[PDB]
């Protein structure tokens, strides 16, 4: 499903995302998007579902992530949170489980999402357009 | 040719051009790095030597990017020529011309060097490590 309502869900959640700002964001992921060979639509979402995951997962109790204050900690929860929202819609519009992630490069989270951000508006455009 | 010297000199004219800064590298080109789907290193390269050659060709004369000074002026040639050089690379390192540029959303050129700059920094860490 290309033109699905899926896409304004991952374009919510990346809204969002791009503006809530904690000690995480500065953390970084493998830079699936420093590709030149590339892969194809359904394999990058399940690439990009792929880092996530691993992220999240490696970040949920990560002792400089969780926070000082309340304020701190209330972030965290919620940049968890919507990073899983983020990996359900993209495992599910990839269809795809198989994913060869040989980038070496790595980006902050933080600039990552924004590509995420720039590529599903792309895909958005081109559904309507 | 992937671990050829030709990435070197790609990579030295990228680094020249992402410190310049002249009234034109404001200016949008087609972003090919807004693509889900994909190509691949020859098509990509090709690609990025298509809108990069699109630009120069387009504001080599532009009244916005000459300059008023005289300090203006050389930067705004030192921009077409360094930019000529990047596509002479890109070119012959693709080996293609061939290229269906069919991205809609634009990329400040400033934005796009940065970001071959990263895809070309891949390749040769690639070729080494």
Same mark, same amino acid.
């Given at each position: ?13 990346? %809204? ?29 979402? @399940? ?7 691993? #992220? ?18 209330? /972030?965290?929860?919620?940049?968890? /949170? #919507? ?13 795809? %489980?198989? @994913? ?10 933080? %600039? ?8 599903? /508006? ?8």
């Amino acid at each position: 499903h290309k033109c699905d309502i899926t896409l304004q869900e991952i374009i919510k959640t990346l %809204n969002s995302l791009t503006e809530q700002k904690t000690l995480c964001t500065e953390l970084t992921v493998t830079d699936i998007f420093a590709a030149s060979k590339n892969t194809t639509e359904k394999e990058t979402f @399940c690439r990009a579902a792929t880092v996530l995951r691993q #992220f999240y997962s490696h970040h949920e109790k990560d002792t400089r992530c969780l926070g000082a204050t309340a304020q701190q900690f209330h /972030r965290h929860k919620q940049l968890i /949170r #919507f990073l899983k929202r983020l990996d359900r819609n993209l495992w599910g519009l990839a269809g795809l %489980n198989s @994913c060869p992630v040989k980038e070496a490069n790595q980006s902050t989270l933080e %600039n990552f999402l924004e590509r995420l951000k720039t590529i599903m /508006r792309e895909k958005y455009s081109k559904c309507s357009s």
